[PDB]
Structures are given as C-alpha cells and as structure tokens.
Amino acid sequence: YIFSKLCTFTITQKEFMNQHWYHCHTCKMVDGVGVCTVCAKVCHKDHEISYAKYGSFFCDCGAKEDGSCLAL
Ligand SMILES: [Zn+2]
Ligand SMILES: [Zn+2]
Ligand SMILES: [Zn+2]
C-alpha cells in the first residue's frame, strides 16, 4: 500500500487490508472492533490496550464519524 504515517483508515477507508491491530478495553473496542498500530500508540496512549491479531481489517478509531481520531 501507499506510504503514510497516519491512521491506516487513510489507506483502507471501509475496505479491508491485512494489518496488525489492537483492542482497547478502555474504549470497549473489543471482539471484531479495534484500532491500527498508529492509533494504538497515539489515540489510545495510556489506555488498556491489547494485541488482537494480524488479519483483514479497517481501523475503527480512524473511522469514527465524529473525527475524534488524532491520527487522521
Ligand atoms: Zn487507526
Ligand atoms: Zn482507547
Ligand atoms: Zn485514531
């Protein structure tokens, strides 16, 4: 995919690609909902996060329609 340092939603939109992603128990982003590597570091700093898996995914942090993601 393209080079970017931002949230991978930048790359995927609501289509999917293989990537590492995380759960956030603080934000109740669990099961099939989670966050990309950038958002885990930035938007969820000091939250209770955990590794989910590597697989087909788009970032639900970047996808939040209120624009609260800090990683574009
Ligand atoms: Zn993200
Ligand atoms: Zn969180
Ligand atoms: Zn984010």
Side-chain angles (χ1 to χ4, degrees):
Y1 38 78
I2 62 163
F3 172 87
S4 171
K5 289 187 201 215
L6 300 172
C7 170
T8 63
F9 190 77
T10 300
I11 300 173
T12 60
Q13 296 296 298
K14 287 187 187 151
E15 290 307 321
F16 306 83
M17 91 186 152
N18 286 137
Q19 61 191 115
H20 299 286
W21 58 277
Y22 300 79
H23 294 132
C24 186
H25 308 266
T26 302
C27 297
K28 298 180 188 171
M29 298 176 81
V30 294
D31 288 301
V33 178
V35 307
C36 74
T37 52
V38 180
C39 290
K41 280 303 138 279
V42 175
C43 311
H44 298 271
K45 189 182 170 125
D46 304 315
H47 295 188
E48 186 165 304
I49 69 148
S50 53
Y51 183 79
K53 56 175 292 182
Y54 179 89
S56 197
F57 186 75
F58 73 81
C59 183
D60 299 298
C61 188
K64 194 32 191 292
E65 279 90 2
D66 73 351
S68 46
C69 173
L70 290 171
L72 193 152

